[PDB]
Amino acid sequence: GELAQALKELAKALKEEAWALKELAQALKG
Amino acid sequence: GELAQALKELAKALKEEAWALKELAQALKG
Amino acid sequence: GELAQALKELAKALKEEAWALKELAQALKG
Amino acid sequence: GELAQALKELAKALKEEAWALKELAQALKG
Amino acid sequence: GELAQALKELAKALKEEAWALKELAQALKG
Amino acid sequence: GELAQALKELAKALKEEAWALKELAQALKG
């Protein structure tokens, strides 16, 4: 239902945020 | 109640944050 | 209730942060 | 209760985040 | 119990993020 | 619960963002 769906969407977004943070860290190192 | 809605908004905002981190990473590369 | 509203406020803050970091990216890129 | 106190802490942190985002926007605008 | 603790952790981390946005703002000014 | 879990994960992500942004701040000063 609605809450389960929203929690799954938040979990996807957290994964995207972590991936993006790694891209920034890489760019900073470069 | 409104918990699921709040989590949907939070997931959407976190996606926007992730995209900004990706844009910063690319900006450091020109 | 109050929990959901505070999470909506947290989402609004991360949305604002995303926007400001996107502007920072545009300024760094030049 | 503990939840109410925690929401209070999050509200304080939101207010600090908001002022720092204002400062970042001020640094960017100029 | 665990939700109030998670919210307190989230407040702490938002304050760290505010500190970092201030540092960005200052760095933009040299 | 699942919610406390996800919010702890978000706090960790905001702490990592704060670290990266402080490194960006130093990079913006050369």
Residue numbers in the entry:
A (entry chain A), B (entry chain B), C (entry chain C), D (entry chain D), E (entry chain E), F (entry chain F): 1 to 30
Wording from the paper:
CCs are quaternary structures comprising two or more α-helices supercoiled around each other with cyclic (Cn) or dihedral (Dn) symmetry. Here, we describe variants with all combinations of the aliphatic residues, Ile, Leu and Val, at a and d to give four classes of peptide: the ββ class, with a and d = Ile or Val; Lβ, a = Leu and d = Ile or Val; βL, a = Ile or Val and d = Leu; and LL, a = d = Leu. Peptides are named systematically appending the one-letter code for the amino acids at the a and d sites to “CC-Type2-“; e.g., CC-Hept becomes CC-Type2-LI. In summary, solution-phase data and X-ray crystal structures demonstrate conclusively that different classes of Type-2 coiled-coil (CC) peptides—i.e., based on abcdefg repeats with predominantly hydrophobic residues at a, d, e and g—adopt a range of distinct states.
To explore this switch between assembling open α-helical barrels and collapsed CCs, we tested if examples of some of the latter could be opened by introducing polar residues into the hydrophobic repeats of βL and LL sequences. Specifically, we mutated the centremost Leu at d (position 17) to Glu to give CC-Type2-IL-Sg-L17E and CC-Type2-LL-L17E. However, unlike the parents, they had accessible thermal unfolding transitions. Both transitions were pH dependent with stabilities increasing sharply below pH 6–7. Neither of the L17E peptides bound DPH, but both sequestered its cationic derivative trimethyl-ammonium DPH (TMA-DPH) with μM affinities suggesting that the barrel states are accessible. Surprisingly, the X-ray crystal structure of CC-Type2-LL-L17E overlaid almost perfectly with that for the parent CC-Type2-LL; i.e., all six Glu-17 side chains are completely buried within the core of the assembly. The experimental and computational data correlated well: For CC-Type2-LL-L17E, at pH 3–6 experimentally the peptide was highly thermally stable, and simulations showed a mixed population of singly and doubly charged states; from pH 6–7 the thermal stability of the peptide decreased, and the main charge states were (Glu-17)62- and (Glu-17)63-; and above pH 8, both the α-helicity and the thermal stability decreased dramatically, and more than half of the Glu residues were deprotonated. Thus, CC-Type2-LL-L17E appears to tolerate two buried charged Glu residues, but above this number severely destabilises the structure. The macroscopic pKa for the transition from two to three buried charges was calculated as 6.8, which is > 2 pH units above free Glu and considered highly perturbed.
